[PDB]
Amino acid sequence: TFLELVEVPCNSVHVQGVMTPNQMVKVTGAGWDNGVLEFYVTRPTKTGGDTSRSHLASIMCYSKDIDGVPSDKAGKCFLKNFSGEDSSEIDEKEVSLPIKSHNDAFMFVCSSNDGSALQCDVFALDNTNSSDGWKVNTVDLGVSVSPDLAFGLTADGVKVKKLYASSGLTAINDDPSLGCKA
Question: Which cysteines in this chain are paired by disulphide bridges (predicted)?
């Protein structure tokens, strides 16, 4: 069934807004150099053709490994929104996403339940939470989805060993320039 986290044939996840309910994304970093996890989502300029609008949302996490992070917020993540469809304005909000373990293992997941909004769950493996596993905290981006909403998490030293998305959301109709095997 096209509603199960299937191994995505890319380095970054790709969905087309007109496909399925679009359950959720799940990308695994598992190993970085300094960290500062930078997640991002895109949007098309046209609905099915020329698809190159701004990156509708981004989530940058500041950990206590990467140098130059807020000592007050080291171990948290920030949400950024770009003026797309339901935006028309940059929205930037600090959120409670704990990433402070030096464990290298981290995941970025995002869901669009209504198909007109994108929410993300920031997963991270803490060394004190290792017995429980990954931590999960929800962050609402306030951004809406569209016919080309391809996701991805990038960070210096981060190599995406596994890339997962719901098989209904695994819509690979993008350009291989987004680090993707077509």
Answer: 10-180, 61-77, 110-120
Quickly tell me which residue has 């320039």 as its tokens: 177
Three-class secondary structure assignment of the chain: CCCCEEECCECCCCCCCCCCCCCEEEEECCCCCCEEEEEEECCCCCCCCCCCCCCCEEEEEECCCCCCCCCCCCCEEEEEECCCCCCCCCEEEEECCCCCCCCCCEEEEEECCCCCCEEEEEEEECCCCCCCCEEEEEEEEEECCCCCCCEEEEEECCCCCEEEEECCCCCCCCCHHHCECC
**Where does residue 26 rank: exposed (0-12), middle (13-18), buried (19+ CB within 10 A)?**
buried
Residue 153: exposure state from Cβ atoms within 10 A (0-12, 13-18, ≥19)? buried
Nearest to 27 by CA among 111, 138, 142: 111
Q: Which tokens hold the place of 71?
A: 């000592």
Alpha carbon of 100 to those of 136, 146, 157: distances in Å? 13, 33, 16
Q: 36 with 29: CB under 8 angstroms?
A: no
Measure Cα distances from 106 to 3, 58, 133 in Å. 23, 16, 11
